[PDB]
Scaffold this active site. Structure first.
Site, short mmCIF file in Angstrom:
data_model
loop_
_atom_site.label_atom_id
_atom_site.label_comp_id
_atom_site.label_asym_id
_atom_site.label_seq_id
_atom_site.Cartn_x
_atom_site.Cartn_y
_atom_site.Cartn_z
N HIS A 1 0.80 -1.20 0.00
CA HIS A 1 0.00 0.00 0.00
C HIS A 1 0.84 1.26 0.00
O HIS A 1 0.45 2.29 -0.62
CB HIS A 1 -0.98 -0.02 1.16
CG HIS A 1 -2.18 -0.84 0.86
ND1 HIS A 1 -3.42 -0.62 1.42
CD2 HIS A 1 -2.34 -1.88 0.00
CE1 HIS A 1 -4.28 -1.51 0.96
NE2 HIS A 1 -3.65 -2.28 0.09
N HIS B 1 -1.31 -12.42 -2.67
CA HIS B 1 -2.32 -13.25 -2.00
C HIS B 1 -1.93 -14.69 -1.74
O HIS B 1 -2.67 -15.44 -1.06
CB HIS B 1 -3.59 -13.12 -2.80
CG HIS B 1 -4.10 -11.72 -2.79
ND1 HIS B 1 -4.97 -11.23 -3.73
CD2 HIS B 1 -3.77 -10.67 -1.99
CE1 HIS B 1 -5.20 -9.95 -3.48
NE2 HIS B 1 -4.48 -9.58 -2.43
C1 HEB Z 1 1.99 -7.67 -3.93
C2 HEB Z 1 1.06 -7.44 -3.02
C3 HEB Z 1 -0.36 -7.21 -3.26
C4 HEB Z 1 -1.01 -6.80 -4.35
C5 HEB Z 1 -0.49 -6.23 -5.60
C6 HEB Z 1 -2.42 -6.85 -4.07
C7 HEB Z 1 -3.44 -6.53 -4.95
C8 HEB Z 1 -4.76 -6.49 -4.51
N1 HEB Z 1 -5.25 -6.83 -3.34
FE1 HEB Z 1 -4.30 -7.52 -1.71
N2 HEB Z 1 -3.38 -8.10 -0.15
C9 HEB Z 1 -2.07 -8.36 -0.05
C10 HEB Z 1 -1.17 -8.18 -1.07
C11 HEB Z 1 -1.40 -7.61 -2.30
N3 HEB Z 1 -2.61 -7.42 -2.86
C12 HEB Z 1 -1.72 -9.03 1.25
C13 HEB Z 1 -0.37 -9.50 1.73
C14 HEB Z 1 -2.84 -9.02 2.00
C15 HEB Z 1 -3.03 -9.58 3.40
C16 HEB Z 1 -3.00 -8.73 4.63
C17 HEB Z 1 -3.01 -9.54 5.85
O1 HEB Z 1 -2.84 -10.81 5.82
O2 HEB Z 1 -3.24 -8.87 6.90
C18 HEB Z 1 -3.82 -8.39 1.13
C19 HEB Z 1 -5.11 -8.28 1.60
C20 HEB Z 1 -6.05 -7.75 0.78
C21 HEB Z 1 -7.38 -7.51 1.21
C22 HEB Z 1 -7.89 -7.77 2.62
C23 HEB Z 1 -7.38 -6.74 3.63
C24 HEB Z 1 -7.94 -7.10 4.97
O3 HEB Z 1 -7.19 -7.28 5.96
O4 HEB Z 1 -9.19 -7.20 5.11
C25 HEB Z 1 -8.04 -7.07 0.13
C26 HEB Z 1 -9.45 -6.70 0.02
C27 HEB Z 1 -7.12 -6.99 -0.94
C28 HEB Z 1 -7.45 -6.65 -2.25
C29 HEB Z 1 -6.56 -6.52 -3.31
C30 HEB Z 1 -6.98 -6.08 -4.57
C31 HEB Z 1 -8.38 -5.65 -5.08
C32 HEB Z 1 -5.87 -6.01 -5.32
C33 HEB Z 1 -5.97 -5.68 -6.72
C34 HEB Z 1 -5.22 -6.27 -7.64
N4 HEB Z 1 -5.92 -7.54 -0.57
#
Ligand code: HEB
Ligand code: HEB
Ligand code: NA
Ligand code: NA
Ligand code: NA
Ligand code: NA
Lengths: 710, 710
Positions: B85, B253
């Site tokens: 982020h 993921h």
């Molecule tokens: C390379 C790196 C990366 C990337 C590019 C992404 C891309 C994404 N993604 Fe992520 N995620 C992630 C890595 C990531 N991812 C992780 C490591 C986690 C877990 C956290 C914990 O275990 O605490 C998440 C978690 C997460 C959640 C849950 C949060 C809480 O704690 O409740 C959501 C709704 C999301 C969506 C998403 C979307 C719609 C997109 C579009 C494509 N994801």
């Protein structure tokens, strides 16, 4: 579509409108200052050729320019209004406003409806500013223009001081009032009036965008007696009493006129609202002639005297010897006009002197006749013009210098030798004494760190950079009213003063120098107790002011009714405690980092008002460490609200109460900027940086009023 | 009632919402910087004990804290989300956003709904920050945390560089979009969508307060195919192609989970909206248990893989080998869940491993299966996991370093030796050559001042401090696509390059050093022609980049489609020309005073695109004087709008047209701050100050990308 937040509407401000406005502590910094970093205006203005300036400015008065021609060939009335409006923004509660920074050339003040066409006046001064350059600030020039106009029209002015430094953006710290429209009546949502038409307290004008009062009457409805009440109120909040107020009003209107010969709705936007073709100016009439006899400014139309280009006794001749009735100017404004005036008393047309126009008075002028107290002063001035001219000249000088601070800052050949009492005079203090001796006797007294530090803090904490009043110079804390203010802890204070006064007698150092030296010694001891050795820098020379030179009543306004730095609140005010801390810190001239280290340092020194432990997050009070921050930032604790302005800092594991704290303490661990600074100072590697930054901030506060140096 | 503008709602901003936001040019200044003025993070971070850091950070991952306990005893997923982020705010159009400044710990980003509970992650890093101190910025720490989480969970990361300096307040220059509420559907007043769901152009997220896309579907309505389209769009605006995008998504993921086991309406305010008891944190549940299995974050609930604490091939096993249907999490969010999963594939409860919970996919995960192009890449990654892991690791490195600028800024032991093409590589240029010789041959060529200056300006003006791309180092102006950009005046450019290339061959100085030296010579000549002698400071060492190391397409974004500094606009855009100038100036890192002197100087040098005379208020073009300002500020002229972005500057007496000008020229005489600077530079005493300030600003721009020095 570009990605820059390129207009002022785009910000964080809209998402959380109640966040502390910490920007007000980081104004007027290097990146906005176009001057070199060693430029010093005070030395430059000492070299200004003032006699040549005086001459150029006098000549400007009868040097009409075609794009905004002078009434009757004389710009004096306009230039006096300029300077009066520049200075009429001042208010005593916080010292903010006034002519001392040249603020009229920036938003919002450049665009207030009360400052209509003062954009022409400022611009007319440019060739002068261009000529004299860095030796003549715009602020000094604006403050001076009306004084020279007076001299040129025949009044003996009392004097003038240079020394106001220019700024380069709006004064973000000044709250001008609650309204979101210009000049709404007091029967509005967001009104500045409470209770029985009581004016909200910092404020010194009757509505948003006026200087003092509405010249057509209260909320636009003529009634000289209700107008008088507002005049008395506002002028009092600008430091002027009844005599000064009548004098200012009459002396102002002894020259010049009201401009309202046209249709106000045809004026273009005010300057900040106008487009680029308007050259920074505003209220331009592109539809018809908006200049000379066709000028529209207030919308009232007429002159108060037969000869508005000259100082004379026309004002009270007209006001008092004619009867007046209400009429509407051509632009639709209410005004008073005399009944059956003689021809020879009619002011002439501003372009053609063979045409006669009309006399006028505003609702505020009629207040000088109808208010019973003003009427008496008016009669004195009609009877005794020499007294009128002397009272006016002094008041005009006070008006234009009331935010200049100590006489040490005044520069130039027309500075009055008199010490006026509103300059809070302080003599020079002896500087030939052995500092170490004083220190050793302070150390040898049995006064604690706590006693020493709190007393010095309290002596200096009254300073405010808005009007440059207060501070530790003068030792006025030992006089009335200060020595008895509740926040100053008068018993503890008297105890310390007894000792320190004896030390000063013994040594030939002023009480003022000793109070400060003593604070230094308490800090030095607290550092020593953490095994750190420093000598705090120290500047001797403070004087002790006398009660004779201390206007007891004018000091009411500097009373510390709140001071987060000693976890002090006198009552439970509307504002949040942390907003109050921010306000005080801005007046002190301190930055957000400075504010932060001071709070952490004062807390562990054990300096809270009443000896409270709120925020005292240490097992070693009296020792100067970064404990406040280390503990504030430790997530082994949780924080539990515990009534008004109070929290319990509780151990998460045992669920026991380890310390208590106020919002003032805890905002340093809550606000995202402040916590960032708190975390810096809580780093393992920043103990000495903490002591060093603390000391520098302490010293800055102790020296803040020392214009007699520098 | 105090007089301080103590909350962010109180300002000039509300009266004139369209004024230039000049504050964005005076950010990150001395009064907000709590470090000493000689503190240099780059030297300090070179001393950081990185191996010990690596160890502490690894240990943090399985060091659960009771106030926000780690899922299954492992904070890795949380730490990866943090870092993702932090970096996922980046966008290519202007380079703004990214992890390069530590911005997530300040408003607004600390309080975006997409950053919910990342306040816990940051806070969990504090003991580390406290330990390593000034040698470990919060920015580097935040950027690193997820890389170490990956290493600890079994992925071979590609590398890491330190070198991001901390800031101390929000990045005021970043426009995050037009909305006034969080996460409104695109069917709203103030929508960021135009035409046929076309996303407004700087922006790289689908709505206000999300990182990229809405995980429940477009405007909250599941449809993997429409979600895919947004994913492709947003990720492209964050510099990622289809392969990088599928890799990032799946690799992300492969670990961690969605938290939505409770009622979202019971969460307290986000951090900037919370009160002081919350310790700078937000979204706190005071009504019921808001931690562990009861955490609510997105409102979706489940993990994508059976073993979310480890890098593995679970993601595509789950996504591709199960069929999925829509369901509602306990907090009411749409999510996909598999049909008839086996027990042994159910992720366990985060507190008690003997309870089984559920698998999930978001609408964006299902897009990786249903979009025909993503499906193919997904199959490759399911078939060839070694390729998956290598593509992901590189993409994750790119993600987290894309705003770090040249490799010269990278510091530490895990910097990859490879030169990746998105680092815009440039070799070191020869520094042993006679500068004066180069200069004499430039002078001895017959290239004008105008040719020399414009060419150097255009070479350097591409720099942007947001992501540290562009600038004069590398001489990419001589390569595609730059050499043919319209704003670069390809004929004039080719003419100059012919000469300067010959000079560089002859001398052993890079073309890049010569372009800059040449600009210097044009400036020196123009000063000389006003009878002023200076040598401009000069730093040799620029390299010439090759076409091989220049990703033609990634440079599209640095094209100068507008540049007020040469009175250039490619088409008639929505934004005002002066807003565009402000944007460019902010990216260049220039202050308002700097912007001002540059404009006046470039104008009189005769450097406008197309050889236009707009703003060229001089009878002596090619001569470096303050004429621009003298004339801009002279009220013997009036200014007449004359069509698009054009005005006639007319003599008031004769009513004849003396010059022409654009809004870019005239804002310096209209905006109240800018005119104040213009007046300073138009003073009789400030001719040399003008030349000197101009030169310093010129030099600052020429050197802006020179991280190989310093
Ligand atoms: C390379 C790196 C990366 C990337 C590019 C992404 C891309 C994404 N993604 Fe992520 N995620 C992630 C890595 C990531 N991812 C992780 C490591 C986690 C877990 C956290 C914990 O275990 O605490 C998440 C978690 C997460 C959640 C849950 C949060 C809480 O704690 O409740 C959501 C709704 C999301 C969506 C998403 C979307 C719609 C997109 C579009 C494509 N994801
Ligand atoms: C000192 C000084 C001063 C003072 C204080 C004052 C005070 C006053 N004021 Fe014054 N004003 C004046 C001075 C003055 N003043 C002048 C000088 C003028 C004129 C201007 C010309 O002429 O331009 C005026 C002007 C004026 C006007 C008109 C403007 C135009 O242009 O239109 C008005 C409305 C007024 C009001 C007033 C009021 C309400 C008050 C209350 C009190 N006024
Ligand atoms: Na003031
Ligand atoms: Na008169
Ligand atoms: Na950036
Ligand atoms: Na896994």
């Amino acid at each position: 579509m570009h990605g820059g937040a390129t207009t002022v509407n785009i910000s964080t401000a809209e998402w959380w409108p109640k966040a502390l406005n910490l920007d007000i502590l980081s104004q007027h910094d290097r990146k906005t200052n176009p001057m070199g970093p060693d430029f010093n205006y005070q030395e430059e203005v000492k070299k200004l050729d003032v006699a040549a300036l005086k001459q150029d400015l006098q000549a400007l008065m009868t040097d009409s320019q075609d794009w905004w021609p002078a009434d009757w060939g004389h710009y004096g009335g306009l230039m006096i209004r300029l300077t009066w409006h520049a200075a009429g923004t001042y208010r005593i509660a916080d010292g903010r406003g006034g002519a001392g920074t040249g603020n009229q050339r920036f938003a919002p003040l450049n665009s207030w409806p009360d400052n209509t066409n003062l954009d022409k006046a400022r611009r007319l001064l440019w060739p002068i500013k261009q000529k004299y350059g860095n030796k003549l600030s715009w602020a000094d020039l604006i403050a001076y223009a009306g004084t020279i106009a007076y001299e040129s029209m025949g009044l003996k002015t009392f004097g003038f001081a240079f020394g106001r430094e220019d700024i380069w953006h709006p004064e973000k710290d000044i709250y001008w009032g609650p309204e979101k429209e210009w000049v709404p009546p007091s029967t509005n949502p967001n009104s500045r009036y409470t209770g029985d038409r009581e004016l909200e307290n910092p404020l010194a004008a009757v509505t948003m965008g006026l200087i003092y009062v509405n010249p057509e009457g209260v909320d636009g409805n003529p009634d000289p007696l209700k107008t008088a009440h507002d005049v008395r109120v506002t002028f009092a909040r600008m430091a002027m009493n009844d005599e000064e107020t009548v004098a200012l009003t009459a002396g102002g209107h002894t020259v010049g006129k009201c401009h309202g010969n046209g249709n106000a709705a045809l004026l273009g936007p005010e300057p900040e609202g106008a487009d680029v073709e308007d050259q920074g100016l505003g209220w331009i009439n592109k539809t018809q002639s908006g200049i000379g006899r066709n000028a529209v400014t207030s919308g009232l139309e007429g002159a108060w005297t037969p000869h508005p280009t000259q100082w004379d006794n026309g004002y009270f001749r007209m006001l008092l010897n004619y009867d007046w009735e209400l009429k509407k100017s051509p632009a639709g404004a209410w005004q008073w006009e005399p009944i059956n005036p003689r021809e020879e008393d009619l002011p002439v047309d501003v372009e053609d002197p063979s045409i006669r126009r009309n006399l006028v008075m505003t609702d505020a002028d009629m207040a000088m006749k109808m208010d019973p107290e003003y009427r008496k002063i008016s009669e004195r001035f009609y009877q005794d013009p020499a007294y009128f001219a002397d009272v006016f000249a002094r008041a005009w000088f006070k008006l234009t210098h009331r935010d200049m601070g100590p006489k040490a800052r005044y520069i130039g050949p027309d500075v009055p030798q008199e010490d006026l009492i509103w300059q809070d005079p302080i003599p020079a203090g002896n500087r030939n004494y052995d500092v170490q001796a004083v220190k050793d006797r302070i150390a040898a007294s049995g006064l604690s760190i706590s006693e020493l530090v709190s007393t010095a803090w309290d002596s200096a904490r009254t300073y405010r950079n808005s009007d440059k009043r207060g501070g530790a110079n003068g030792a006025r804390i030992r006089l009335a009213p200060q020595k008895d203010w509740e926040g100053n802890e008068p018993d503890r204070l008297a105890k310390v003063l007894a000792v320190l006064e004896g030390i000063a007698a013994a040594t030939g150092a002023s009480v003022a120098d000793v109070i400060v030296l003593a604070g230094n010694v308490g800090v030095e001891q607290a550092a020593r107790a953490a095994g750190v050795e420093i000598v705090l820098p120290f500047a001797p020379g403070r004087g002790d002011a006398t009660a004779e030179q201390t206007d007891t009543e004018s000091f009411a306004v500097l009373e510390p009714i709140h001071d987060g730095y000693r976890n002090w609140l006198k009552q439970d005010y509307a504002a949040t405690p942390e907003e109050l801390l921010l306000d005080r810190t801005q007046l002190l001239g301190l930055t957000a980092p400075e504010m932060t280290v001071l709070i952490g340092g004062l807390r562990v020194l054990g300096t809270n008002h009443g000896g409270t432990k709120h925020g005292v997050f240490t097992d070693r009070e009296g020792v100067l460490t970064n404990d406040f921050f280390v503990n504030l930032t430790d997530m082994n604790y949780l924080w539990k609200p515990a009534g008004k302005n109070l929290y319990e800092i509780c151990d998460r594991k045992t669920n026991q109460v380890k310390w208590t704290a106020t919002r003032v303490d805890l905002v340093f661990g809550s606000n995202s900027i402040l916590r960032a600074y708190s975390e810096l100072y809580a780093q393992d590697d920043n103990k000495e940086k903490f002591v060093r930054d603390f000391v520098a901030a302490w010293t800055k506060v102790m020296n803040a009023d020392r214009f007699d140096l520098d």
